[PDB]
Paper text:
Ribosome hibernation is a key survival strategy bacteria adopt under environmental stress, where a protein, hibernation promotion factor (HPF), transitorily inactivates the ribosome. Mycobacterium tuberculosis encounters hypoxia (low oxygen) as a major stress in the host macrophages, and upregulates the expression of [name] protein, which is crucial for its survival. The [name], a dual domain HPF, an orthologue of bacterial long HPF (HPFlong), hibernates ribosome in 70S monosome form, whereas in other bacteria, the HPFlong induces 70S ribosome dimerization and hibernates its ribosome in 100S disome form. The [name] binding would block all known critical sites of translation initiation: the decoding center, the a-SD sequence of [name], and the bS1 protein at the platform binding center of the ribosomal small subunit.
At this cleft, the NTD makes extensive interactions with the [name], anticodon stem loop of E- site [name], r-protein uS9, and also with the inter-subunit bridge B2a. The linker also interacts with the anticodon stem-loop of the [name] bound to the E-site of the ribosome. The E- [name] anticodon stem-loop interacts with the linker regions in both [name] and MPY hibernating 70S ribosome. The [name] and E- [name] binding would obstruct the binding of RNase to its target sites, G779, C1365, and A1484. The presence of E-site [name] in 70S with and without [name] indicates that E-site [name] binding might not influence the [name] binding.
Numbering used by the authors:
A (entry chain w): 1 to 126
B (entry chain j): 25 to 150
C (entry chain k): 4 to 101
D (entry chain n): 2 to 117
E (entry chain d): 2 to 209
F (entry chain t): 2 to 83
G (entry chain h): 2 to 154
H (entry chain o): 2 to 101
Write the structure that this text describes.
RNA sequence: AUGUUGCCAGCACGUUAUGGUGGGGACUCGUGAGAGACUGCCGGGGUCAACUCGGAGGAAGGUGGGGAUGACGUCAAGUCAUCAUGCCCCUUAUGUCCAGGGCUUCACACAUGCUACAAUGGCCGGUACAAAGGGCUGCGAUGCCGUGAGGUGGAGCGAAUCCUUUCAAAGCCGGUCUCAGUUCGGAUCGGGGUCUGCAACUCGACCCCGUGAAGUCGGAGUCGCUAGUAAUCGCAGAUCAGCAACGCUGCGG
RNA sequence: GUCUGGCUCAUAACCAGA
């Protein structure tokens, strides 16, 4: 996977670390990734306890996956962003293994929104 | 004499009706030198057809504003109004045909932020 | 000889008030009028961005509307003239005498 | 018909056939046809030999086309290159020379896109 | 950006322009001298509550009418204040500039004066709840006032966190066009920054 | 290019400089600062130190570059590649 | 369409043929609002058909429509969280719309050097039952029949 | 914007009225007719000797009070930010919000 | 109600040049006031209630169409570079003046658009219909000179009057091209010019001659739009000496 | 098996053709 990182100000080595960490997420995505962008920003105010902000955006075959984190330095922000992206990709999977427990089962046991409605005759059963 | 007006989306038509032959005088030009489109001619002569008074009224018309289609529509409304003024008791026939209704369809105002009246700029999620 | 009296004001009621008061005074002096002939309203439109920074898609529109009335008299007797330069009008309305 | 070494198109109107000459576009062909006197709508298979001759000597007379034009353009470009002017090294490295933007566009001078 | 300025919403319906003149070639310099006049009057007079400043022009003579809650403060008994304002308005290249000092009939029913008083109280030492409550009660005590809303925001009480607070009494129909809402905004100067106070006062409606 | 009626444009400074330069037939390096001046046939031998933004680059005029500007021969931006 | 059906536009009868369907055809072939060119193309095609066959163009055009009009069409249906190709009966209006759209498109991909000749040839071959629109109707009917197992829902 | 730059704009205007009024305009009248002998006259060179600030081409319409160099309106001499605020307060005669 | 700079139906003068001209409120039109849609009425459902369906009348029928108007708050969303401002920092400088350069750099990536890939078309000739808006050291006409940008010249206009041509293009008619990387497409490049500006090298626009690239309808994926809408065609304005405007804001076919 | 069209979030499987 190819990632372009648009940092700002002073963050030496943040671009390379973010690139190498994010590029490892291609195998986790179950569909081809069309685009992947990362942005690193730092808060000017020293009063901020977590100044560094990292944002990511992945185009998973038309499905947009994004996350945003805060950290005290570039490495921690990148690692937390990787964790959040992994969780989002896990929740997006949508392949059969990810939607086999949600497909309605049985015949009369259990009901879901998309469950097949029961067929009813014209006359009351009696 | 009698004189009515017809208006159709910025086209204004003044009509002067006299009981002569079926000669069509549109700003000194005939129905063929003007309006060289058969559909426009049929749209013009429809009120005469439904009233069956074809070729018994010399028509003098003043045309300004809009294009050929708007001019034709406003002219048709003008002959409808002139006919309703000449022979009142035909109002059912013209009205149920819709020829007595001014068409309130005008160019929608262009809106800021949109390329056209409703067309919106292309938006990219990725 | 007739002279043109031209009114231009941003407020309709103001220019109508001035027009009626002017026809009143010229009729007092005994002059023939034409009436306050209306003229097309002039519209100047401007579009501005609401926010100081960015946010181009949000715009605000303004206009300035100018109303015009035309007064023409006849038989310019000197009494009507002396009355004409002795008229007090709202500052909003101006007069053009030609 | 072989015109200044150029095989004319088989069936074309005269001026547009003459457009195929490297030194002639549409205006040049029109004015030379009008001045010399041949019809402008007649097809290329209707030329007689003397018509070919009159076109030939007129064109060699008051026009410059084909190899001489190409070599003159090449020499002009080379001379512009060798004096070290801005257009010089612009020609040297295959980039647009008339101030066109190069951040995104200018693939015509850059050639086909390459991936690095 | 939530609410448009109430004066501008009803500029052509209920409220009136504060400047009355006509110019075609000299619109630009008229505007320049008008804003110069307004800013000069703003900085010069701050004790007396300056509620409104009108400017009228007709050729050479310029007529400026201003409304204050304390006319005696801005006017000199021997004309000393009048002399100063007249001279420094001649200095504004206004040619003949002539003034009508006026006084407002109900100071507590005017939004600008209410905001000025609330901000002045806020500046020195007063807690904002006291100021808002006092202004609201004083305003509703007046006969024509049908509803008042008072709001100021900023570092209230010298705190590190900006806050927005507001109280309302009665009816404040901001969306109703015929309703006349007197709107007043004025900024409170505090040692911790700037506090902006907004006042809406609703007094019936005008039908033309 | 500049219209023909106005004629070529040359700054007065280096104009008087080259007139006093060629009056005694000796051509030393002339330090200049008007990159907008056209080349005139009076420059054929003179060597110009035309400005660049940082320094002055020597420009030795020839017959070929007459009619251009001193600016085309002092390339401003420096690019070596990525 | 969440709150109910929308009203239909009552387009007018043609002046020089007096039929609803030729107006529907000109609106189908219309591009960019150039209505005059669309009517010229349609009228030229109808006159070419009249010249070739020797009879009224409206009757042969109607014959082409009935030859290419579909009756059974397949739509994807999601019942009980599963999607299949379900054959569905087609209303008369939709069948006419599909037939006209097929005719216009498949005429646009012909090779008769001009839209008028392409359209005339397509209508003639549909009238005789050899056009590509007739073929397309054959395949859509074949697909509807081949999925008859899913017709119960 | 910056006080120095607000001032320098005005200084250009007084320079323009002092010089561009006749000095930087008669030279243009000399150069216009090809019949006029411009080449020996050095009306080009004489007009180069004039200060650059004489030229109105160096002027910039800034906001009359704010100093804002962009989003300017020639009718009012005011920035888009200031026009919006004063029109809303009813300060510019005969100006109001639009609808049509 | 209203007649000028706007209409001209009936009257007269017109000379090709036309409301052009004397005249006239008749019809438009311009701009003031007012009427008109209120489930007002009828029939049916309805708790005899809200509400709903259909019909009559009407220009318009059920908040007629489109605008302006954006509740308490959210996202420490944006803006200390419109402005103001607490605190901190600079003050022989982080202030201030000037010339030159840069913001236009390019192995690439993303995004918004324009032009195309053609015959529902290209080119040539003739020919018909708009709205809105702008104009004083500005719009600038007739005429003359260029092939064309344009040059000379200045009529009349603070403008319902004059100029933007009398205003358009798509459209209609006629001729030609004959399915080709072409009479498509116009990039790039060579030469020659015009205009603005003190000055078009970096780095303007336009004009002429020549040059004639990719491009054969575009993968995964994705966007806008329900009616005068999408699609398509042209016109105008702000900024502005000039323009990078194919952008933005409007207008009509 | 191999090339499409249909279908699927895509490969799959199923359907229509060469």
């Amino acid at each position: 996977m190819d990632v372009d990182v648009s940092t700002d100000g002073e963050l030496p080595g943040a671009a390379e670390y973010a690139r190498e960490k994010i590029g490892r997420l291609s195998r986790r995505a179950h569909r081809p990734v069309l685009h992947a962008r990362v942005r690193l920003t730092r808060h000017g105010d020293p009063a901020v306890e977590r100044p560094v902000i990292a944002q990511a955006n992945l185009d998973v075959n038309g499905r947009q996956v994004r996350a945003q984190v805060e950290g005290v330095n570039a490495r921690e922000a990148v690692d937390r962003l990787e964790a959040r992206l992994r969780s989002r990709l896990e929740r997006i999977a949508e392949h059969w293994e990810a939607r086999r427990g949600g497909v309605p089962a049985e015949a009369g046991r259990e009901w879901r929104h998309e469950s097949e409605p029961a067929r009813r005759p014209g006359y009351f059963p009696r | 004499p009698i004189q009515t007006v017809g208006r159709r989306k910025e086209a204004v038509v003044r009509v002067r009706l006299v009981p002569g032959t079926g000669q069509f005088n549109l700003d000194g030009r005939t129905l063929e030198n003007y309006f060289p489109n058969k559909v426009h001619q049929q749209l013009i002569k429809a009120p005469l057809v439904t009233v069956d008074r074809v070729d018994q009224f010399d028509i003098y018309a003043h045309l300004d504003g809009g294009g050929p289609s708007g001019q034709a529509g406003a002219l048709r409304l003008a002959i409808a109004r002139a006919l309703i003024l000449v022979q009142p008791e035909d109002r059912p026939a013209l009205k149920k045909a819709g020829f007595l209704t001014r068409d309130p369809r005008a160019i929608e105002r262009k809106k800021y932020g949109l390329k056209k009246a409703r067309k919106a700029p292309q938006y990219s999620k990725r | 000889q007739k002279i043109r009296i031209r009114l231009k004001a941003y407020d309709h009621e103001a220019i109508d008030a001035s027009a009626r008061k002017i026809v009143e005074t010229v009729t007092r002096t005994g002059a023939s009028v034409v009436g306050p002939v209306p003229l097309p309203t002039e519209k100047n439109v401007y579009c501005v961005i609401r926010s100081p920074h960015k946010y181009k898609d949000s715009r605000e529109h303004f206009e300035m509307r100018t109303h015009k009335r035309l007064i023409d008299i006849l038989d310019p007797t000197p009494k009507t003239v002396d009355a004409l330069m002795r008229i007090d009008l709202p500052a909003s309305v101006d007069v053009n005498i030609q | 018909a072989r015109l200044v070494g150029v095989d004319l198109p088989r069936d074309k109107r005269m001026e547009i056939a003459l457009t195929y000459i490297y030194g002639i576009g549409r205006t040049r062909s029109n004015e030379i046809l009008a001045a010399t006197g041949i019809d402008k709508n007649m097809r290329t298979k209707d030329l007689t030999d003397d018509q070919v001759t009159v076109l030939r000597d007129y064109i060699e007379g008051n026009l410059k086309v084909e190899g001489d034009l190409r070599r003159e353009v090449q020499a002009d470009i080379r001379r512009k290159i060798e004096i070290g002017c801005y257009q010089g090294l612009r020609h040297r490295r295959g980039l647009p020379v008339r101030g066109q933007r190069t951040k995104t566009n200018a693939r015509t001078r850059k050639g086909p896109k390459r991936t690095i | 950006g939530q609410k448009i300025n109430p004066h501008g919403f009803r500029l052509g319906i209920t409220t009136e322009w504060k400047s009355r003149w006509y110019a075609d070639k000299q619109y630009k310099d008229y505007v320049k001298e008008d804003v110069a006049i307004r800013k000069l009057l703003a900085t010069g007079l701050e004790r007396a509550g300056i509620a409104d400043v009108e400017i009228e022009r007709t050729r050479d003579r310029v007529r400026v009418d201003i409304h204050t809650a304390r006319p005696g403060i801005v006017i000199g008994r021997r004309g000393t204040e009048a002399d100063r304002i007249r001279a420094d308005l001649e200095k504004l290249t206004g040619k003949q500039v002539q003034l009508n000092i006026l006084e407002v009939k109900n100071p507590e029913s005017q939004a600008q004066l209410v905001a000025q008083g609330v901000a002045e109280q806020l500046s020195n030492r007063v807690a904002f709840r006291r100021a808002m409550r006092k202004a609201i009660q004083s305003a509703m005590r007046q006969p024509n006032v049908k509803g008042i809303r008072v709001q100021c925001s900023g570092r209230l009480g010298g705190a590190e966190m900006s806050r927005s607070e507001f109280y309302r009494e009665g009816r404040v129909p901001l969306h109703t066009l015929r309703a006349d809402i007197d709107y007043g905004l004025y900024e409170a100067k505090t040692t911790f920054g700037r506090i902006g106070v907004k006042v809406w006062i609703y007094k019936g409606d005008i039908v033309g | 290019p500049r219209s023909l009626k106005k004629g070529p444009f040359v700054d007065d400074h280096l104009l008087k400089k080259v007139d006093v330069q060629n009056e005694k037939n000796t051509k030393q390096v002339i330090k200049t600062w008007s990159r907008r001046s056209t080349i005139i046939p009076d420059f054929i031998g003179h060597t110009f130190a035309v400005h660049d933004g940082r320094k002055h680059v020597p420009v030795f005029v020839t017959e070929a570059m007459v009619g251009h500007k001193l600016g085309e021969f002092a390339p401003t931006r420096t690019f070596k590649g990525h | 369409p969440r709150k109910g059906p929308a009203p239909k536009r009552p387009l007018v009868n043609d002046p020089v043929y007096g039929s609803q369907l030729v107006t529907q055809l000109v609106n189908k072939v219309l591009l960019e609002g150039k209505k005059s060119l669309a009517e010229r193309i349609v009228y030229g095609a109808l006159e070419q058909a009249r010249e070739k066959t020797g009879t009224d163009p409206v009757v042969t055009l109607k014959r082409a429509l009935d030859n290419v009009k579909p009756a059974l069409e397949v739509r994807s249906r999601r019942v009980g969280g599963a999607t299949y190709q379900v054959p569905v009966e087609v209303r008369p209006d939709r069948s006419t719309t599909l037939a006209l759209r097929w005719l216009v498109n498949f005429s646009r991909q012909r090779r008769e050097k001009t839209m008028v000749e392409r359209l005339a040839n397509e209508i003639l071959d549909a009238s005789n039952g050899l056009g590509a629109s007739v073929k397309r109707r054959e395949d859509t009917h074949k697909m509807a029949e081949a999925n008859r197992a899913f017709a119960h829902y | 914007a910056k006080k120095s730059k607000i001032v320098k704009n005005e200084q250009r205007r007084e320079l323009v009225q002092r010089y561009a009024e006749r000095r930087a305009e008669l030279k243009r009248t000399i150069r216009d007719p090809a019949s006029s002998p411009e080449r020996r006259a050095a009306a080009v060179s004489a007009l180069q000797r004039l200060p650059r600030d004489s030229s109105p081409v160096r002027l910039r319409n800034r906001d009359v009070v704010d100093g804002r160099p962009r989003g300017h309106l020639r009718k009012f001499g005011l920035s888009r930010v200031r026009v919006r605020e004063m029109a809303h307060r009813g300060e510019l005669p005969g100006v109001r919000k639009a609808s049509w």
